[PDB]
Design a binder for this molecule. Structure first.
Ligand SMILES: [Cu+2]
Length: 166
């Protein structure tokens, strides 16, 4: 169990630690660390919740529904916090393509992968800091999809992150 704390994930922003910058986020208010589903689950319109019971409110998609972190193109530091550390296979990062539609359900086919970090089947620390590159054809509102793949289970944790690139 874990979440992306910086830039705050959509679920994390639903919690008091995230400043309640998103309202009406279901289970994300209290347990943004709990978005666990099998690896390679990418159901259109169910990316933010990973299809998990109680996280449905996260799946709403409009241009103005969610709080964004202002970022630039180029390097971006990602910080995860793990409430329960697990042996790790992988960390994968995706971002919406230039020209995507922020008022349509999220579809992984409309993202590019932009980073992939091998977990080496080791147990990470409670705070994990990584740096990924935001491509320079992205401007304005985008969604980063951060995926922590567990080493000793068939599952992953899924973190949609709303950013405003300027
Ligand atoms: Cu866990």
């Amino acid at each position: 169990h874990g979440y992306v704390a910086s830039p705050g994930s959509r679920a994390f922003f639903g919690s008091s630690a995230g400043g309640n910058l998103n309202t009406n986020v279901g289970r994300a208010q209290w347990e943004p660390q709990s978005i666990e589903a099998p690896k390679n689950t990418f159901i259109t319109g169910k990316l933010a919740s990973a299809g998990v019971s109680g996280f449905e409110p996260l799946d709403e998609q409009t241009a103005t529904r969610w709080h964004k972190t202002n970022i630039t193109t180029g390097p971006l530091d990602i910080t995860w916090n793990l409430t329960a550390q697990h042996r790790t296979a992988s960390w994968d990062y995706y971002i919406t393509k230039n020209g995507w539609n922020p008022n349509q359900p999220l579809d992984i086919k409309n993202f590019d992968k932009i980073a992939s970090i091998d977990g080496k089947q080791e147990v990470p620390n409670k705070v994990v800091k990584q740096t990924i590159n935001i491509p320079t054809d992205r401007k304005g509102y985008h969604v980063i999809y951060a995926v922590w793949g567990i080493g000793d289970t068939v599952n992953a944790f899924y973190q949609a992150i709303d950013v405003n690139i300027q």
